[PDB]
């Protein structure tokens, strides 16, 4: 246990054999400053107000993705090809701010204890798929080296719409719905 | 289900008391298991598991790897504090304090940053503790927290309730009243 006022991750470097795929992010005190888009080779900010402090050469990431790609192969061998244990994620659904009908708000779907980092998170409005007003965080890191991820639905709380968050995972026998109604 | 194998490599910087005590750690993880660590307080690569013994042995002999990991605290950690972290530590977002009944009264302190918050409840300018429950800080995932602090109340005509909030972004506390209808 390391005591500190603050802690950055100047590089969470995620690489997995399934895909294969990767992710490169920096985090300051639990929050994602930026990510690197590995297909596009382009640094990207989910929350643009943070470009203001710190650019980043996409090349630095693609570099470490190469190393991880190499090292994962080494480490697979040493561990006798020991496949990752699927975890059972904890979904919870809550609002950003207090609920007032007619007041625009953002719904927050929190998927904790994600492992491995493979999850489809969609929203449902009256049991139908919503694509409008949905956005995500990247896979955020945890000291037990599992991940969490957070999807957002912006919405107009109405007389009747009923919302669900649909989470799909390999630790889940069947797509898991979490409900939220005004 | 598809069989997967996972590699995580984290470079972490731990700051304390401005930039006086700084401490660099790197973890090399297979699935959920950190197998080899470099820790600026230890000084060299340590194996956390059996599987990390020879990796750390090797790296530790390479003059150039060892030396590079040692410089990391000053070259990377201390640099990022200057480029980003210091300004991020300047970030102040004010809490929105709102009282609503669900006999239970819910003070909902929302949208704030940084994380440090005090929240107190009152019944008639007298602090109420026995009847308070709080959530942990909740992380919104945008750059804000929120927190919900409940007072268990048996309302009477006349009574004034006050949710009282202190946060680094506020020069003076926020108070929000709720009068028994």
């Amino acid at each position, epitope marked *: 246990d390391i005591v500190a006022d603050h802690v950055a991750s100047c590089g969470v470097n995620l690489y997995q054999f399934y895909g294969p795929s990767g992710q490169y992010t920096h985090e300051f005190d639990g929050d994602e400053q930026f990510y690197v888009d590995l297909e596009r080779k382009e640094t990207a900010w989910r929350w643009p107000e943070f470009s203001k402090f710190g650019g*980043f*050469d996409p*090349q*630095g990431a*693609l*570099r470490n*993705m*190469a*190393v991880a*790609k*190499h*090292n994962l*192969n080494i480490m697979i061998k040493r561990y006798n090809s020991t496949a990752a244990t699927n975890e059972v994620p904890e979904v919870t659904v809550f609002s950003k701010s207090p609920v007032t009908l007619g007041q625009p708000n953002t719904l927050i779907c929190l998927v904790d204890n994600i492992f491995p980092p493979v999850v489809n998170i969609t929203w449902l409005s009256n049991g139908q798929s919503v694509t409008e007003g949905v956005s995500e965080t990247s896979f955020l890191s945890k000291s037990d080296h599992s991940f969490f991820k957070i999807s957002y639905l912006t919405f107009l709380p109405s007389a009747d719409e009923i919302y669900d968050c649909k989470v799909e995972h390999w630790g889940l026998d069947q797509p898991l719905l979490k409900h939220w109604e005004p | 289900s598809p069989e997967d194998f996972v590699y995580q490599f984290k470079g972490l910087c731990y700051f304390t008391n401005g930039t006086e005590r700084v401490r660099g750690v790197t973890r090399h993880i297979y699935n959920r298991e950190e197998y080899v660590r470099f820790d600026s307080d230890v000084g060299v690569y340590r194996a956390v598991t059996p599987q990390g013994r020879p990796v750390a042995e090797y790296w530790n002999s*390479q003059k*150039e*790897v060892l030396e*590079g990991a040692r410089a990391s605290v000053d070259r990377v950690c201390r640099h990022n504090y200057e480029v980003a972290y210091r300004g991020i530590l300047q970030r102040r977002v004010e809490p929105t304090v709102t009282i609503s009944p669900s006999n239970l009264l819910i003070c909902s302190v929302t949208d704030f940053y940084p994380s440090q918050i005090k929240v107190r409840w009152f019944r008639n300018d007298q602090e109420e503790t026995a009847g308070v429950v709080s959530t942990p800080l909740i992380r919104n995932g945008d750059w804000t927290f929120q927190i919900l602090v409940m007072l268990e109340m048996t309302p009477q005509r006349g009574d004034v309730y006050t949710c009282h909030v202190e946060h680094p972004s506020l020069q003076s506390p926020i108070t929000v009243e709720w009068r028994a209808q």
Partner: T-cell receptor
Amino acid sequence: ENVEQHPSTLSVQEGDSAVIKCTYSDSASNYFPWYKQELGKRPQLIIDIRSNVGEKKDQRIAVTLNKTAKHFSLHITETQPEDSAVYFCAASSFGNEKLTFGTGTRLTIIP
Amino acid sequence: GGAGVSQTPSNKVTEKGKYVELRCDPISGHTALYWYRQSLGQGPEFLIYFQGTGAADDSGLPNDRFFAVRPEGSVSTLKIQRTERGDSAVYLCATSALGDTQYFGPGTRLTVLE
């Protein structure tokens, strides 16, 4: 990106000193090696300099660096004919480790 | 590998449309391998960069007829597919302990003829 190198060809008397100037664009460049290349051979790494120092000296050879004006040059003093080769400056940055080279200077030391 | 970066042969002479491989045995222990191309008259230009077994940067490969491998994170072969006159250059190889400081090999001059 890009690195510019002058002069194109240089002739100096045995004994006199020779100077090649270079200039780079990407301000993030932190490492600047120089190479000597003899004909039919690959580039030989003879000296390098990083953005935390202004000057480096190694025997007859000297390298300089102005990080604010993005200039860096190479000084070869007391030249000897063995010095006759093509010289290259290159530049590299912390996140992009590939070298981007200059157009070459063809040094000729007249014996 | 050796004490320095080796490439053999010094020269490969072929005709159009034929397949050419350029080998490169790294300085033993060196984790990063780079392939550069030098059209003579001008300086070296980047093709590909390996970190261990994998490609860190392939941006310099001139077209889809170029591909490079390094199956054991050691020796690396550069494969050129359907060869054209315009591919005539010297192919330098450089390696590095970690990535920054690069030591070149003698290069292989590919000479592609009608």
